[PDB]
């Protein structure tokens, strides 16, 4: 209200960004105007181009300008591995590990209390992806939450007896810690999930 | 990332406090869940970058030739509050202040070539000439450079029959002396006032 309408609007529109509260949006708006008008315009152009041009890959459903994303388009990748994740940011997180297989991107996880079931998250499309490929292993890389685990289990039962190996990413202690500093539940899980050798 | 995603990420890093990691997450979240919000932001950015100028009186950022504060006639025309930027106008407005403002472009910094003309001193002098102020409140930030700017303005305005005041600063309110940094405490002690 102390700001003129166009400044007020820029502030409110900046709050649309993830992790940007009101105070931070105020500072961003005013900094753009004070010192980087051309940078503001470049961001506007980049936003318009991406919001209009970026769709979804027809295979894995990740974000892509092309009909096949960079990962599905690349022939160097390992066609025997499919990694199932809950969203495009998870595709990016797994990519940073050096994984070179294929992906399928669910829309989040099963959540009965939000009315989000198999159809809503993309299970039928996952089934089609598997039918249309030649995978030997499907890696369940849903988030390690109650809901993420329930989604993994639903997919594992759905796909049983089709000659695929189904795996789940390891749960346990993160690297670098001391046991005394790890979250108790994580430690209990790492113990209960201990493996021989 | 595809070229369009890469461009969006690089352009988002232009924002204050947004590193590469944070820009990556912003880009992808915006695309996954709020494409139309991204377009609205683009439109708001373009409109503001092209349409926002300066208030002709206080020199704050405004698309209107008089900003909300200068455009209200019901304010106190005897008080002028001098600040370093538009966010400081906003901060002082929240206190219920009802006078007028002048907005400098930052503070003096001669080694960056920001002297009196660059920060708006001539425009401050014109504001004073064109008004009928009885008090000028120096509300630059209590930083080394903000204080130097306040002092420059105080010497400029001396002997004009104006009351020249400075916002209180030193130990912060709510502070315990045991927790304040020593430099602040030494300053507050040396700058102690009557009670
Ligand atoms: Na486990
Ligand atoms: Zn793909
Ligand atoms: Zn104004």
UniProtKB/Swiss-Prot annotation, chain B:
Gene Ontology terms: biological process: double-strand break repair; recombinational repair
Statement: the UniProt record of this protein carries the keyword DNA repair: yes
UniProt keyword list: DNA damage, DNA recombination, DNA repair, Metal-binding, Zinc, Zinc-finger
UniProt keyword Zinc-finger, yes or no: yes
Coiled coil: none
Annotated GO MF terms: DNA binding; zinc ion binding
Ranges for domain Toprim: 78-172
Zinc finger (C4-type): 55-70
NCBIfam families recorded: recR (TIGR00615)
HAMAP family: RecR (MF_00017)
Record-stated family: Belongs to the RecR family.
Described function: May play a role in DNA repair. It seems to be involved in an RecBC-independent recombinational process of DNA repair. It may act with RecF and RecO.
Full protein name: Recombination protein RecR
UniProt source species: Pseudomonas aeruginosa (strain ATCC 15692 / DSM 22644 / CIP 104116 / JCM 14847 / LMG 12228 / 1C / PRS 101 / PAO1)
Source taxonomy: Bacteria, Pseudomonadati, Pseudomonadota, Gammaproteobacteria, Pseudomonadales
Gene that this sequence comes from: recR
